[PDB]
Design a binder for this molecule. Structure first.
Ligand SMILES: [Mg+2]
Ligand SMILES: [Mg+2]
Ligand SMILES: [Mg+2]
Ligand SMILES: [Mg+2]
Ligand SMILES: [Mg+2]
Ligand SMILES: [Mg+2]
Ligand SMILES: [Mg+2]
Ligand SMILES: [Mg+2]
Ligand SMILES: [Mg+2]
Ligand SMILES: [Mg+2]
Ligand SMILES: [Mg+2]
Ligand SMILES: [Mg+2]
Ligand SMILES: [Mg+2]
Ligand SMILES: [Mg+2]
Ligand SMILES: [Mg+2]
Ligand SMILES: [Mg+2]
Ligand SMILES: [Mg+2]
Ligand SMILES: [Mg+2]
Ligand SMILES: [Mg+2]
Ligand SMILES: [Mg+2]
Ligand SMILES: [Mg+2]
Ligand SMILES: [Mg+2]
Ligand SMILES: [Mg+2]
Ligand SMILES: [Mg+2]
Ligand SMILES: [Mg+2]
Ligand SMILES: [Mg+2]
Ligand SMILES: [Mg+2]
Ligand SMILES: [Mg+2]
Ligand SMILES: [Mg+2]
Ligand SMILES: [Mg+2]
Ligand SMILES: [Mg+2]
Ligand SMILES: [Mg+2]
Ligand SMILES: [Mg+2]
Ligand SMILES: [Mg+2]
Ligand SMILES: [Mg+2]
Ligand SMILES: [Mg+2]
Ligand SMILES: [Mg+2]
Ligand SMILES: [Mg+2]
Lengths: 147, 52, 187, 124, 105, 52
RNA sequence: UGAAAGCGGGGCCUCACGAUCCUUCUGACCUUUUGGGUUUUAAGCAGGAGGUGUCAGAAAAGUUACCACAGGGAUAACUGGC
RNA sequence: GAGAAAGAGAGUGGCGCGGACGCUACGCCGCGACGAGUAGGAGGGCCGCUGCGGUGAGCCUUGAAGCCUAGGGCGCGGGCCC
RNA sequence: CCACGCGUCCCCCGCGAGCGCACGGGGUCGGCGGCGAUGUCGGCUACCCACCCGACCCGUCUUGAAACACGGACCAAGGAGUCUAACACGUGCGCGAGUCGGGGGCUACGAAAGCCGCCGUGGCGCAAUGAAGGUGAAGGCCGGCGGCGCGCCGCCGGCCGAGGUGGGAUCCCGAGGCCUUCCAGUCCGCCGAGGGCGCACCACCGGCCCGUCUCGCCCGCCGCGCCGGGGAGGUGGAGCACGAG
RNA sequence: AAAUACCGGCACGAGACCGAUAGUCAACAAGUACCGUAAGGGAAAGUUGAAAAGAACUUUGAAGAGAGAGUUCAAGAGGGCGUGAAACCGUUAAGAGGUAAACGGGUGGGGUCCGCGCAGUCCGCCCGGAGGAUUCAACCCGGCGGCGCGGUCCGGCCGUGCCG
């Protein structure tokens, strides 16, 4: 609201919070992001490095759907599937292992970040990390590919 | 509180009828006039026509 | 006159919360009393932490309180956060905890009451232990916010690993003259 | 409860009245009529009030009972005392002290009863 | 004239944008307009389905969405000739047809 | 309590809603403070006014 | 190089020099060239160079007595002052 | 309030019916030292104007807003009440 | 002389009562005197006038303005940091590894409000690095089968398992004791020598991921290939290192 | 065709908008008066009272204009008339005046009004003196209320408690 702002306590004060020596002029440093090479060199090097110049190849008609491959980690792997699968699989006596179809939950690639509990799985992904595969093997379990 | 009293139903003649229903837990949700004032302030701005 | 400089003549610290919440102010009305009338400094620290801002009482997570209660010596103690005990989903086995917090989220308190613990708020904490005896006081990660990635020694300045403010992370967006050795100079 | 109701009522009640650097509360069971947690007569489980009778003689003393807190009609009990000034005040003193009925304001009730009695004896 | 630290920004307001601004104060009026027209249509085609014709199972094109099956344009001609529905009688009995759909599967 | 849910039953007429938890439960401050748990573990009051 | 200890990644030390963009050359059995393959071509990645001497780096001749505008006593042509 | 870490602590054996004020805890009270200020920053306004939701069982033809005043006053002051 | 008893062991030589004065934790009188109904009493303030001291006209630009610097005859009304978008930080609120219906739909004030969940499409967040191909965030011990002038270990079965150092608010244990006649003797507290497990955070050393360089020896098979995977050691990153949006 | 856009037009409804120097330029004989050769530029300007009941009649003056009378609740609302400020002016009353006026601090003098001042506060307890009551304490009956002090009286209810 205007009732709580600073123009309600800058009435009676002549310069209205902008000064007497340096008047509040209109655009003293140019409009916008101007003068980066010339007179705002120190700001654009002390606060936005890398800004000027070209780098990298150009890819004209880019499609994020082609580049779509969202990832999940092994510490979140068991959160895809409900609790009773995990407790029935830890309770299970025949060594039957539950099947986590991660693509059905919505992640294409499985990466291995976290500690995975001592419990056999079948992780059914589209892409795997090397460490994710070896943690699934080291806990005992399978890595199934889908297309 | 954790309890729930037993609120009585009144007939149209004024006196209490025999029907007697337990008090719903909505009446023991927390009282916060901060949230009530905030929501009332921001939602009373929605029925408002422009001017220019 | 005196030769006294008045720059730091006023402490900046709070006397009260800046919230118009009334339950937090009733907790403050209780812990003002316990702070000035006990000789335990747990009451002073929890008075200070009720005073603080949302950003200075960061949300402590259930995994941190699992670890910092599984440290040796502090068995069947009472963990006490003044922020918010949030659920952590990358943990499976939850021991019997004794948690005191301003607010616990829904499936975090579901997890704790399923494991067989007990969540008591600060009023019944002061009833259960007025001087706070038998309590592991705990704090969330205060540098855990993403805005501390931008603070400190500025980017474009050597040996400063500071995240700059960019509208979109990509190839074209601030990779070229300060970042490269070919394009210009590298810091 | 009581403090929860007070943290709402303290600056928002329609009995509250603020002018001339003073503050008051025009609620019907407020001894000394001032805005306080001690003297507010709506937010408590037990409360006295001292009022003049509808007849121009005596004092009706109002007690709040224990059980019917959420029942406002059968909550207050009213006893009309029409006698001399000494025994009226001794009745109010015994009524508040020996019941142990909210002894914070027995003396405020006695002050208000004596004020009503001096206003109720004929004007010179 | 940028200050100490912050983003550098390029807001696209350099044109005359105030002369071309679409403001949405007829949003609830237009919702009530669509709703009244939808109810008048639904009671006009009176026992027929309110949502119109039937539209086939169709799964989405690209790599991001081919795990999901949605509603399509219309039942293809090979689908109709296998189901024994004539391609001109399907639109009469309420079946959406498009001839453009192939069947690779 | 079908609309806004109980404390242990969720909202049967919303999708995912439950009554919001209290921040302190025993709201009465004076009954807390005049309790033998807290009145025991205090120091003595210092109410002798020491003027200049 | 010296037998060797060592010494040397320019000149005994204190000066002798140049960002982005663009071009050119050098390097890898390198990446991309877009539905797939091969081959030219082009784009990239890293290292030099082509140069900005107003040297943290615009691409730039005058005249106005026909003159104009915003200002400056921050600054001249008078007096006055030291 | 008392120069000296810590209980006016509990257990086992050898008549007259009385007692001021307080505590809007965002309240009240006690100590000390302190008070310059342009540009500027900040806090508090029971300072002021207009309109809206609440509210005062508000005010008003037994005279509202407005205006005038050698009348009585309050506030450090913005202002305000008769 | 701020020295006052009786009783014993050793050496040299724990409650007495009253009254009262007061250089004693900030003034009281348990002292008085006058004038008061048509001219007197009180009213600082506000009306006029007098006198002493003080006293240049404001705003502004300025190193410096009363300036022979500019603006201003006087009065009434109007009259200048606003709104939208984006960002950043701080604070309040809801939920919280999630969060948000803003677009759509269903049911006087109300063009509001409620609701959707197989309307979370999508945004932001939960993962980074690389120009790109791409890859994509602990390890150790045991048993078995110089390989030799993979004590290292390649591969299989078991066990421990998700850093360390220093400082650290809080807490935890407690050598002793906190007296009412004296000794044992318990409980409830409380104080505390010293000793602990240490939140957040800070500093440092480690470690893991991505790029790049250097040196190496291995490992896999449907395609034994200009193939794929691995290690050690530096280094560049807006990373991880038990969320914080 | 549909979903879609609409500051023109016909007819509508609404407003945390403006309230006659505001809001359209325009609340009114407004794109009018007026200016420009022209293209074009373009104002100012609301309010008696409830009802005209809009001041009959007498008198001075040639008349404007007055004085009486009268309407009205009110002309202290009299045909540009609600309210009627300020600058500025006329007059009356008071006070003053040769360093232009004005100002700050301090009092003094004179006023104007106020204090309904002008024999000056009461309030408790007690003592003594003159009164007047249907009158006190204690008992009996009825109702209402407050509370292991009923350890552990009987019966219900709830649990953001548990077990069958
Ligand atoms: Mg200033
Ligand atoms: Mg400023
Ligand atoms: Mg200026
Ligand atoms: Mg400036
Ligand atoms: Mg300057
Ligand atoms: Mg600016
Ligand atoms: Mg330059
Ligand atoms: Mg001083
Ligand atoms: Mg200062
Ligand atoms: Mg300061
Ligand atoms: Mg600036
Ligand atoms: Mg449709
Ligand atoms: Mg070398
Ligand atoms: Mg030489
Ligand atoms: Mg360029
Ligand atoms: Mg010439
Ligand atoms: Mg000439
Ligand atoms: Mg000069
Ligand atoms: Mg000269
Ligand atoms: Mg100052
Ligand atoms: Mg003088
Ligand atoms: Mg100037
Ligand atoms: Mg100058
Ligand atoms: Mg200056
Ligand atoms: Mg001069
Ligand atoms: Mg001049
Ligand atoms: Mg000038
Ligand atoms: Mg002038
Ligand atoms: Mg913030
Ligand atoms: Mg409407
Ligand atoms: Mg006008
Ligand atoms: Mg007007
Ligand atoms: Mg107008
Ligand atoms: Mg006008
Ligand atoms: Mg008028
Ligand atoms: Mg009148
Ligand atoms: Mg009038
Ligand atoms: Mg008039």
């Amino acid at each position: 609201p205007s009732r709580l702002r600073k123009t309600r306590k800058l009435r009676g004060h002549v310069s209205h919070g902008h000064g007497r020596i340096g008047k509040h002029r209109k655009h003293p440093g140019g409009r916008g992001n101007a003068g980066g090479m010339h007179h705002h060199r120190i700001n654009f090097d002390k606060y936005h490095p890398g800004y000027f110049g070209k780098v990298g190849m150009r890819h004209y008609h880019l499609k994020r759907n082609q580049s779509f491959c969202p990832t999940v980690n092994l510490d979140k792997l068991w959160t895809l599937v409900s609790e009773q699968t995990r407790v029935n699989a830890a309770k299970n006596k025949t060594g039957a292992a539950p099947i986590i179809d991660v693509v059905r939950s919505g992640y294409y690639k499985v990466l291995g970040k976290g500690k995975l509990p001592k419990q056999p799985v079948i992780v059914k992904a589209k892409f795997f990390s090397r460490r994710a595969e070896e943690k699934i093997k080291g806990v005992g379990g399978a890595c199934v590919l889908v297309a | 509180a954790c309890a729930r009293p037993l609120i009585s139903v009144y007939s149209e003649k004024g006196e209490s009828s025999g029907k007697n229903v337990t008090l719903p837990a909505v009446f023991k949700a927390p009282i916060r006039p901060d949230i009530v004032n905030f929501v009332h302030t921001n939602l009373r701005k929605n029925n408002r026509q422009p001017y220019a | 006159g005196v030769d006294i400089r008045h720059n730091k003549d006023r402490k900046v610290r709070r006397k009260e919360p800046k919230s118009q919440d009334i339950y937090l102010r009733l907790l403050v009305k209780l812990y003002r009393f316990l702070a000035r009338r006990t000789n335990s400094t747990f009451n002073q620290v929890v008075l200070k932490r009720l005073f603080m801002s949302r950003t200075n009482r960061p949300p402590l997570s259930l995994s941190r309180m699992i670890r910092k209660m599984k440290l040796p010596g502090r068995e069947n103690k009472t963990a006490v956060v003044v922020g918010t005990v949030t659920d952590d989903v990358r943990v499976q086995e939850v021991p019997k905890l004794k948690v005191c917090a301003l607010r616990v989220t829904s499936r975090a308190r579901s997890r704790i009451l399923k494991a067989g613990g007990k969540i008591l708020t600060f009023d019944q904490l002061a009833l259960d232990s007025p001087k706070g005896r038998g309590t592991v006081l705990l704090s969330g990660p205060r540098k855990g916010r993403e805005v501390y990635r931008h603070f400190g020694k500025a980017p474009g300045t050597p040996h400063s690993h500071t995240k700059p403010y960019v509208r979109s992370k990509g190839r074209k967006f601030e990779r070229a003259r300060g970042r490269r050795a070919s394009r210009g100079y590298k810091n | 409860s009581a403090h929860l109701q007070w943290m709402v009522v303290r600056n928002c009640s329609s009995f509250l009245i603020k002018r001339n650097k003073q503050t008051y509360s025009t609620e019907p069971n407020n001894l000394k009529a001032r805005n306080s947690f001690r003297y507010n007569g709506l937010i408590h489980r037990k409360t006295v009030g001292v009022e003049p009778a509808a007849d121009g003689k005596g004092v009706v003393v109002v007690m709040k009972r224990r059980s019917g807190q959420r029942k406002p009609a059968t909550s207050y009990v009213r006893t009309t005392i029409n006698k001399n000034a000494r025994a009226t005040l001794s009745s109010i003193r015994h009524m508040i002290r020996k019941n142990k009925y909210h002894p914070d304001l027995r003396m405020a009730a006695i002050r208000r009863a004596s004020a009503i009695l001096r206003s109720q004896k004929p004007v010179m | 004239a940028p200050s100490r630290n912050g983003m550098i920004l390029k807001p696209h307001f350099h044109k005359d944008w105030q002369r071309r601004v679409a403001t949405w104060f007829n949003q609830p009026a237009r919702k009530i307009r669509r709703r009244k027209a939808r109810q008048a249509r639904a009671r006009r085609i009176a026992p027929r389905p309110a949502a119109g014709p039937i539209r086939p199972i169709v799964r989405c094109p690209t790599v991001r969405y081919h795990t999901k099956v949605r509603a399509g344009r219309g039942f293809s001609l090979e689908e109709l000739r296998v189901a024994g529905i004539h391609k001109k009688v399907a639109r009469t009995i309420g079946i959406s047809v498009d001839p453009r759909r192939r069947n690779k599967s | 309590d079908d609309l806004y849910g109980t404390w242990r039953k969720a909202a049967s007429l919303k999708s995912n809603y439950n009554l919001p938890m209290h921040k302190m439960l025993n709201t009465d401050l004076s009954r807390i403070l005049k309790s033998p748990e807290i009145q025991r573990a205090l120091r003595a009051p210092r109410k002798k006014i020491h003027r200049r």
